[model samples]
Target: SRPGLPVEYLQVPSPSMGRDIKVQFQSGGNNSPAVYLLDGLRAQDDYNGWDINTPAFEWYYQSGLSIVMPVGGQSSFYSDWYSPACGKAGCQTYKWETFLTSELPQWLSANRAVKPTGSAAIGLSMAGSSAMILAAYHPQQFIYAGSLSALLDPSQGMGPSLIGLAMGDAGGYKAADMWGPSSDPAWERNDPTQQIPKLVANNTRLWVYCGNGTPNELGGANIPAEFLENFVRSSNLKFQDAYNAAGGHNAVFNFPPNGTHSWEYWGAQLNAMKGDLQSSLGAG
Candidate 1:
């Protein structure tokens, strides 16, 4: 017989969004060790890619652990932008950092019968980079940070422009609105490379995985996948060098020779990291 896991869909009131945010929680125990699974760039209000595109829930459901997955944040990068980000409905005061690190945990403590103040965080693509910075900023709060096929080095060549375009195309979001501009100190401040020292100082566990511009079975001949395979490979390599140059320790970077920038690989990477999470975080 299989373990019967429990899952709950809850609404979290966010003063930043000026509304409620939907989040999914899954676990087998009240005080289960928690893992925060974040979404990608095109995150939707209805659900996240971890639900729609991957087998994340299926893999962790009966693992005697708790999972916190947020529903939406199209191109938001989960950052506390300098200004509000407006959408078709209205402008939202994007305060994801505060919500994740403080508000969300507070409510979880009150309701979930567990305190998620210190947890492991994992993100794919865009949110992947966000997870690293979040851990660095709140070292004590996040002991493990993982990123898969993410744009780790956003300050790279033409990165600023692409970021603005991607965010705009996603949901009328503006990167400049989040920070001041590419030239602003906030840009470097939020950069994972620059924040590596912080992660090192706190001895936080780090995991970075990316493909090497190689196409696998599913994404073969797909243009977007090809581009992502190559782009993410190049960027992660650059970021890897930056990580090394910073004398950063406590990170494991896996550069697979074959894969793409799709959910197949992301989900697989998550499964691959389960052993580490189990030993480090006492999860399933």
Candidate 2:
């Protein structure tokens, strides 16, 4: 009745993609809390985490939470791009925020048995930022939001270098296209830092985690580990400080004293968030 939960696929229409958006949802019984799990830039192919990395759906199913995963959003950061990066196939203009915030929720209400009142959103790496962004923008939709090893600060001017290494060419991706290059309007608007006040005001439960140490050499892709670790730590601290200053909310930030920015740590963080989600949503 748990691990073998039935997962259904839905095709959602997207104005940006000009095509159908494929999303995966694991349906459970009545009064079940829905949790949206967002994938990172490198792990967006068709339920890869569940299929290969870790059986997340099964893991959360044991905790009686419905899992929703939207796949195939490579380097899109789960947001709309100002202009498409040329020559990147299937990397065309993306309207992920609209689809997730508006279309996906509507579809869920009509189709799934998810309790409309209490649901959570959790993500890893880039999707972590995206998850927080979504919760900030649509507080009514997400009661609990968690970011694991997330790139929390998009306004720190770190995207250009990271994107270059990720895409193998700086010209392939533009930070300004996703967020305005500077902190005046574009960066401020998209950055999770600027949206923290709104999140705190709305009482959105927050769970953020990262590793304190540098990336593991044994782990895949060590080049961006240091930068990512620093960014996540700084952003988490900033958010925590802001939350404290503006009256406390149900927020928890966990940085394992001996962890790194890799799948091993991320898997553990997801498990930890299960408790946080249950606590925040008051799940039975």
**What C-alpha lDDT values do all the predictions have?**
0.80, 0.70
lDDT, candidate 2, 190-219, per-residue tens: 667778887888888888887775655436
TM-score of 2: 0.85
> Which candidate ranks first by TM-score, i.e. highest?
1
- Can you tell me which runs of candidate 1 are displaced by over 4 Å? 1-5, 88-90, 218-221
In model 1, pairs of residues that clash are none
The candidate scoring highest on lDDT is 1
Off by over 4 Å in 2: 1-3, 48-51, 85-87, 157-171, 214-227
Please provide, for model 1 over 1-284, each residue's C-alpha lDDT reduced to its tens digit, 9 standing for 90 to 100: 22344566889998766778899877636767778889998898888788777666677867766788988888888888788887656677788898888888778878886547568889988888899998999877788899888887787567777888888878878888887789988787777877777877877788999877667775545678768767877778877787778777778899978887778788888888877877777665
